[PDB]
Curated annotation (Swiss-Prot), chain A:
UniProt KW keywords: Antibiotic resistance, Cell inner membrane, Cell membrane, Membrane, Stress response, Transmembrane, Transmembrane helix, Transport
Phenotypic consequence of gene deletion: Becomes sensitive to some antibiotics (chloramphenicol, puromycin and tetracycline) but not to others (erythromycin, rifampicin and fusidic acid).
GO CC entries: cell outer membrane; plasma membrane
Name of the protein in question: Multidrug efflux pump accessory protein AcrZ
GO process terms (BP): response to antibiotic; xenobiotic detoxification by transmembrane export across the plasma membrane
UniProt induction comment: Constitutively expressed, may be repressed at 45 degrees Celsius (at protein level). Positively regulated by MarA, Rob and SoxS transcriptional regulators.
Gene responsible for this protein: acrZ
Organism of derivation: Escherichia coli (strain K12)
Curated annotation (Swiss-Prot), chain B:
Gene name for this UniProt entry: acrB
Protein name: Multidrug efflux pump subunit AcrB
Induction: Positively regulated by MarA, Rob and SoxS transcriptional regulators (at protein level).
Known partners and oligomeric status: Homotrimer, with large domains that extend into the periplasm, interacts with AcrA and TolC. AcrA may be required to stably link this protein and TolC. Interacts with AcrZ. Part of the AcrA-AcrB-AcrZ-TolC efflux pump.
Species: Escherichia coli (strain K12)
Mutant phenotype after disruption: Loss of susceptibility to contact-dependent growth inhibition (CDI); inhibiting cells still contact the target.
Regions crossing the membrane: 16-35
Length: 39, 50
């Protein structure tokens, strides 16, 4: 009960940020593939 | 897993459907292990976590 609120608050923060790096790699690989294939 | 399903389906009455399937599968796997004589050990719990 004591650390339960902190555990929940911590659980709320990974999901958006991890999703964010996921979009980060999709964006980066998309752009790098575009520039590589442009030549 | 429950939190990410709720956030990415935006309906608690809809996200309750898959969440209650987790205990069913876990307990059924426990029963299957019991039927085969296997014992609850760290490896089996790692398999369930995966």
């Amino acid at each position: 009960m004591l650390e339960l609120l902190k555990s929940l608050v911590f659980a709320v923060i990974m999901v958006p940020v991890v999703m964010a790096i996921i979009l980060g790699l999709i964006y980066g690989l998309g752009e790098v593939f575009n520039i590589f294939s442009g030549v | 897993v429950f939190l990410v399903m709720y956030l990415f389906l935006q309906n608690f009455r809809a996200t309750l459907i898959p969440t209650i399937a987790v205990p069913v599968v876990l307990l059924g796997t426990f029963a299957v292990l019991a039927a085969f004589g296997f014992s609850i050990n760290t490896l089996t719990m790692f398999g369930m976590v995966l």
